[PDB]
């Protein structure tokens, strides 16, 4: 016979809420990337989005070690020529902290159409409450 | 019985045909290597 393949019409996938207070950024990020791929499920299939929907909250309260609070620099280029634009970690936490968790997880997820579809399942909030009470996210303690 | 006569075994050897394909063994350069005076038509030195 043939190896089982998950079918994306019939993938059941759950909702999880994770409190990101005082977690380390990379270690949380790597756990979220694992859950959004669907690597924790026995029906994992590399071309099917099998993962779960995670609601990260308290994104502004995430922690980093060392002097990464001030020395970790987020560069991006704008397309216009001298457009190299940097922003440290504390400037990002002040401006938009959702971008901190989302940049991390996005760089841990496979690049391509599927990993974009995998990132659409991450919902990050800078506060303590979310609109998604209808989906009943159970508390993923990680 | 003129369609049952047949030569000896080993008497008619094939004949090298050079220049036909990759499988045949003698294609492209026909067995005469890369450039030089010897790989040239008419090419060769005297006795």
């Amino acid at each position: 016979m043939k190896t089982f393949t998950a079918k994306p019409e019939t993938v059941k996938r759950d909702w999880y809420v994770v409190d990101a207070t005082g977690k380390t950024l990379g270690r949380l990020a790597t756990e979220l990337a694992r859950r959004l791929r669907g690597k924790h499920k026995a029906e994992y299939t590399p071309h099917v989005d099998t993962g779960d929907y995670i609601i990260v909250l308290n994104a502004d309260k995430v922690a980093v070690t060392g002097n990464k609070r001030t020395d970790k620099v987020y560069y991006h280029h704008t397309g216009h020529i001298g457009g190299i634009k940097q922003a440290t970690f504390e400037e990002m936490i002040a401006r938009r902290p959702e971008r901190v968790i989302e940049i991390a997880v996005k760089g841990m997820l496979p690049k391509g159409p599927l990993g974009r579809a995998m990132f659409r399942k991450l919902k990050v909030y800078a506060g303590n409450e979310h609109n998604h009470a209808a989906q009943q996210p159970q508390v993923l303690d990680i | 019985r003129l369609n049952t006569l047949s030569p000896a075994e080993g008497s008619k050897k094939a004949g090298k045909r050079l220049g036909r394909g990759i499988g045949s063994g003698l294609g492209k350069t026909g067995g005469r290597g890369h450039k030089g005076q010897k790989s040239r038509s008419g090419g060769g030195v005297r006795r």
């Binding site: - | 990759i22 499988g23 294609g27």
Partner: protein
């Protein structure tokens, strides 16, 4: 109730009445074989192997059809060095049908 057994080179997880395509066995077409080297029997209670192959288990399988599989082309081209070699291959198989699994 399924059963995992070892066969020619590799392993097969098979229920009863299921046709399996194995490697070429040296058996006649309607003849019945037995695999005495079953590695798992699960019905609603698992039975598997501390020391391997289960002590009381055997699979009786009736041979259905010897055959020769789909042709595959084997292509060996070395770019730019005047070498290519094509070849073909049809693997022999043996379809058996699982008559019964005895735990």
């Amino acid at each position: 109730m399924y059963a995992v057994f070892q066969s020619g080179g590799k392993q097969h997880r098979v229920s009863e009445g299921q046709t399996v395509r194995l490697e070429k066995l040296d058996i006649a077409t309607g003849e019945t074989v037995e695999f005495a080297e079953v590695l798992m029997i699960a019905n609603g209670e698992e039975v598997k192997i501390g020391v391997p192959f289960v002590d009381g288990g055997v699979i009786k399988a009736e041979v259905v059809a010897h055959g020769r599989g789909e042709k595959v082309k084997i292509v060996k081209f070395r770019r730019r060095k005047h070498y290519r070699k094509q070849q073909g291959h049809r693997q022999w198989f043996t379809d058996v049908k699982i008559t019964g699994i005895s735990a």
